[PDB]
Amino acid sequence: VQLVESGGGLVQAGGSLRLSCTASGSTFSINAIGWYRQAPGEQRELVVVDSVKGRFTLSRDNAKNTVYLQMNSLKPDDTAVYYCNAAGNRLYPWGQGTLVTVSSGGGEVQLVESVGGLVQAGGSLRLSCAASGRTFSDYAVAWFRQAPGKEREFVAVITRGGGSTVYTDSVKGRFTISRDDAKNSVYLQMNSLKPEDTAVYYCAADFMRSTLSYRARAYEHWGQGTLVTVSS
């Protein structure tokens, strides 16, 4: 038996994914299969349209020996490595799995992020963020990001007046945060892009003067999210 799971990705909360599983090989591989979910830093558990969800749907295409999990109204809780196997029958050999990462911002002003991009490693890229409802001068503005199969992390922040900037260690040489209060925006210049930089980036703002915080929980205002993809 050669199980292969497919079709995972990095998506936003509220979004949707369809996972597929092709049972193959030189033995029977009966198609009464199910899905298993291993949350990062925990052991595999089972999920099946069964486990307390009006949101997932198990479905089949016998012609293909494929099983399908349609996932709607995704929550950050559904982040995990996803695997098909028996769930009667038992214990086929597990396949590599497929990774599912459901990104989410923390937490008036309406922050809007520029589009981001698909860019090759060691390239550059420039994110921009703009408050639409209000004067952004007054706000401390941070960037957070959420990469595949990781926790949401602090990237960078700039204070009102721009005289204080702080970067997470993994970025110190590469990204620069800055602002043009005249254009009502903040910018993240991203240099020497690397696989680790692929994530959903989030702009976030808070009114200060207070101590300069690096927790998402400290920031009332949050962009929708913008996707950065580094290839090579």
Residue numbers in the entry: 2 to 49, 60 to 98, 101 to 120, 128 to 229, 232 to 254
Can you quote the paper on this entry?
IL-18 SCAs DR3085 and DR3087 both adopt a conformation in which the two VHHs are in an antiparallel orientation with the C-terminal VHH shifted upwards relative to the N-terminal VHH. This offset places the interaction interface towards the VHH C-terminal side and increases the distance between the CDRs. The DR3087 VHH interface features a more diverse set of hydrophobic and predominantly hydrophilic and ionic residues that engage in an extensive hydrogen bond network and bury a total surface area of 950 Å2. Consistent with the screening data, DR3085 drove the highest maximum IFNγ secretion, followed by DR3097 and 3087 (21%, 15%, and 8% of the IL-18 maximum signal, respectively), while EC50 values ranged from 0.01 nM of DR3097 to 0.7 and 1.8 nM of DR3085 and DR3087, respectively. More importantly, this linker length screen revealed increased activity for one of the three SCAs, DR3087, showcasing tunability of the system through linker-length variation. While DR3087 had maximal activity with a linker length of 4 residues, DR3085 and DR3097 showed the strongest activity in vitro with a linker length of 10 residues, which was the linker length of the initial library screen.
